[PDB]
Structures are given as C-alpha cells and as structure tokens.
C-alpha cells in the first residue's frame, strides 16, 4: 500500500529470511528502485553487475529500441553470496494476470 510498486527489489538472503510479500519485502529490502517495467514498446533490458562485492543494477527502459541504454537505479555494496551458486529466473502471477516473457 506504499505505492512502491512497480519496483525492482534487491534482497540477499542466507536462507534464514522469510520473504513476506504483504509489504512486498520492503522490510528485508537491501536496495530498491521504484520503476515501472510493464507494457513497454520494446523489451526491457537490465544490467546486473556483481563486481568487487558491489551489485550494480542498470536498466534499459524498453521505451527505446537501443539495447545499451542502461540506467542505474539501485545497488548494494559488500554483498555476500555463495560464490558457487545457481543462476535462476522465476515469475509469479496472482489474481491479476501478467505474461512474464524473457527473450534473452
């Protein structure tokens, strides 16, 4: 109810933090950028950059056909992750309906 969403939320968990979606995880939110990403004329592109233990997020809006028009919105530093880990993508659809389609 805080009008944060649509937003991109960075949350890093060690396995002991329960993700509460009722606040949309604003309590355990390490960093966030309040940006709409639905209904774009061009597909949305994002740059996720973990380098020197900082996790930098740069986003292309999808309002342009340019691929490289990435814009910074949020990041964290001294980020801790299992250096051996699995990359994964996942999406959910609730009562309201979205098509979550990943081109590349």
């Amino acid at each position: 109810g805080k009008k944060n969403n649509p937003a991109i939320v960075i949350i890093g968990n060690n396995g002991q933090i329960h993700y509460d979606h009722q606040n949309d995880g604003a309590s355990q939110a390490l960093a966030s950028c309040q940006r709409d990403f639905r209904n774009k004329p061009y597909p949305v592109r994002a740059k996720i950059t973990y380098y020197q233990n900082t996790l930098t997020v740069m986003i292309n809006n999808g309002f342009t056909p340019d691929k490289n028009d990435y814009e910074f919105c949020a990041k964290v530093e001294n980020m801790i992750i299992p250096a051996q880990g699995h990359f994964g993508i996942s999406a959910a659809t609730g009562g309201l309906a979205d098509d979550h389609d990943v081109l590349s």
Binding site: N39, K40, F63, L96
Partner: protein
C-alpha cells in the same frame, strides 16, 4: 479487501499513449535536473564574482 473489475479493462491505443505520457515524464525530471543545475551554476559564480 475486494477487487473491482474496472482495473482489468483497457484499450490498447490508450495504453500506448499512456506509455508515451510516461515517456514525457522522463523529460520532466530531465528539465527539473537542468533547472537546478542551472540554478546552482548561477549562484556559485555570483559568489565567485564577488569573491574575485
């Protein structure tokens, strides 16, 4: 809580121009940054002219 059904319905042409309207909002923040950037430039040289 309840959920109305008006939120679901849309016309595509209007939603396209809504994206155009959202595209115009980028220029607004761009203008707002440009104004404040011009405002701080004017003030600092005003101190710099007086200090000189």
């Amino acid at each position: 809580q309840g959920q109305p059904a008006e939120e679901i319905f849309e016309s595509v042409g209007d939603r396209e121009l809504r994206q155009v309207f959202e595209g115009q909002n980028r220029i607004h923040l761009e203008i707002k940054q440009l104004n404040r950037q011009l405002d701080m430039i004017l003030d600092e040289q005003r101190r710099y002219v007086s200090s000189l």
